[PDB]
Amino acid sequence: ESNTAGDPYTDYQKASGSIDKAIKLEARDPLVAAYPVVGVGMENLIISTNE
Amino acid sequence: VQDSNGESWNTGLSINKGESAYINANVRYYNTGTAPMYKVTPTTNLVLDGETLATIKAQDNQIGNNLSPNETYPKKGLSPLALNTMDQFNARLIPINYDQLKKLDSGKQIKLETTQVSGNYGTKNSQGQIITEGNSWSNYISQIDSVSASII
Amino acid sequence: ESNTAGDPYTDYQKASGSIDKAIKLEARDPLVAAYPVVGVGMENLIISTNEHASSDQGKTVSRATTVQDSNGESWNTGLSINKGESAYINANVRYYNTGTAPMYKVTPTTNLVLDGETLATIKAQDNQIGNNLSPNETYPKKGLSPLALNTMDQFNARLIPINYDQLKKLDSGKQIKLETTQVSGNYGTKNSQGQIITEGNSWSNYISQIDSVSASII
Amino acid sequence: HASSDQGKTVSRATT
Ligand SMILES: [Ca+2]
Ligand SMILES: [Ca+2]
């Protein structure tokens, strides 16, 4: 398998670090996937009553 | 003969019962992974008392260019985004009808929930230039979630 | 045949497993087709009747000398309605997959049928597209609230209207049914460099070829 | 486009 973890980067690109430099150190192990988990959080909510 | 000197003053108020109010949510994005996301495009449901009022995809005003792991968009010391519109071109505001407005004027809250997020990854092309355009993260979400074990 | 089953993947690609890793196990047999079966299901339906209601008050004073005086009041209440766009419809849907392959960029088309007549055929635009639909799962996922099929426009700016007769009969036992007439979506293939690409890879180019050369087993 | 309306009125007149 060239991409062991299933992410866009191969085993060599991850081990050798020749990828994006914002990827966490953790994710340069071929077994740990480089993978973002993004979520949204609402702060407040405003109602424009259009009479 | 006769004379008359009258005065008058009137006050009126109208309302549309299909678009009785406009909704504006203030949001912030969060990354808790090991990779940064470029061109972050979330999709969110706005749920009020069982019913989903609107499913909104983040358009050009609400997209975040970079989102590194363990950080937010906007950054920590900024105010949250405004999720104003439902249109592809940021020209159409999010409406709610008369019953949803009447119950919103009570203890009822509107909850938000992220159904998915879009975004790109970066790769170095022929010359040493990082490209993050055709590099959708969605082509790998199923392939990663299927071959893996999840640890939080 | 290089593609015995009629799916986008050859015999060697399926047998050896060098394809998408979300493809179900059985679908890596050359005879079983890698093929998703996506359907839509409605959860509830909301009606925004768009009347226009008006209130008004008023005072008035008056004097009249040949002597006289007068102090009148008023308060009025009106209500108007359009009969071609008497209400707006909002359906809450959720997509399902019961196939052996994931669908990327799931774009369904649904009829909204009310007492014999189809009110609208809606194609899922940018707000209502699901990026991933892996087999035996839903969009949105199990623990989320359903989508809002809110608009009928290519740009998500035009709401779904119903006229006065459809609204009047909808204020009765009449229900609006939803039915999926088709679903479109992409599949993934590894390109020259090992990047998965799911853009020109439409699933509709193989639905007829698969449905013709196959036997169906539910 | 169908429209309805109601209305009341009170009045007093003193010579
Ligand atoms: Ca390897
Ligand atoms: Ca063959």
DSSP for C61-123?
Answer: EEEB----EEEEEEEEEEEEE-SSS-EEEEEEEEEEE-SSS-EEEEEEEEEEEETTEEEEEEE
Resolution number, Å: 2.9
Closest CA to C112 of C162, C173, C183, C153: C162
What subunits touch chain C, counting only 3 or more CB pairs under 8 A? A, B, D
Chain D residues whose CB is inside 8 A of the C68 CB are 13-15
CA dist., res. C79 & res. C87, Å (int): 15
Closest CA to B35 of B149, B147, B144, B146: B144
CA dist., res. B36 & res. B65, Å (int): 10
Q: Separation of C11 CA from ligand 2 center, angstroms? A: 5
Q: In Å, how far are A28, A41, B113, C73, C171 from B29, measured between CA atoms?
A: 24, 6, 12, 55, 41
Helix (H) or strand (E) holding B62: none
CB contact under 8 A, B34 and A39: no
**ω into residue B74 within 30 of 0, thus cis?**
yes
Q: Which residue of B has its CA nearest to A25?
A: B34
A29 is in an annotated binding site: no
The shortest CB-CB distance from C132 to any of B16, B134, B142 is to B142
Looking at residue C186, its amino acid is N
A1 is in an annotated binding site: yes
Hey, which residues does C64 pair with through a beta bridge?
Answer: B4
| Burial group, residue B71, by CB count within 10 angstroms (0-12, 13-18, 19+) | middle
CB contact under 8 A, C68 and D1: no
CA dist., res. B133 & res. B144, Å (int): 20
The answer to whether C143 faces chain A, any CB pair under 8 Å, is no
Closest CA to B4 of C64, C111, C143: C64
CB contact under 8 A, A34 and B32: no
CA dist., res. C15 & res. A49, Å (int): 61
CA dist., res. B98 & res. B17, Å (int): 5
The answer to whether A4 faces chain C, any CB pair under 8 Å, is no
Q: Which residue of A has its CA nearest to B129?
A: A20
| Burial group, residue C40, by CB count within 10 angstroms (0-12, 13-18, 19+) | buried
Q: What's the gap between Cα C186 and its chain centre?
A: 17
Hey, which residues does B4 pair with through a beta bridge?
Answer: C64
Residue with tokens 């099929």: C149
- Nearest-CA distance from B76 to chain C in Å? 27
Examine chains C and A and say if they touch (3+ CB pairs below 8 A). yes
Which residues neighbour C207 within 8 Å (Cβ) at sequence distance 6 or greater?
none
Closest CA to B28 of B141, B121, B114, B110: B114
CA dist., res. C85 & res. C93, Å (int): 23
Looking at residue C104, its amino acid is Y
Experimental approach was cryo-EM
Closest CA to D2 of C185, B73, C82: C82
Chain C residues whose CB is inside 8 A of the D1 CB are 80-83
| Burial group, residue B52, by CB count within 10 angstroms (0-12, 13-18, 19+) | buried
Q: In Å, how far are B98, C91, C120, C167 from C176, measured between CA atoms?
A: 21, 9, 11, 11
The answer to whether C196 faces chain A, any CB pair under 8 Å, is yes
CA dist., res. C105 & res. C124, Å (int): 10
Closest CA to A41 of C126, C109, B117, B11: B117
Interface of B with C in 27-86 (CB under 8 A): 43, 45, 47, 50-57, 86
* C149-152: Cβ within 8 A, 24+ apart: C149/C90, C149/C91, C149/C92, C149/C93, C149/C110, C149/C122, C149/C124, C150/B54, C150/B55, C150/B86, C150/C90, C151/B86, C151/C122, C151/C125, C151/C127, C152/C120, C152/C122
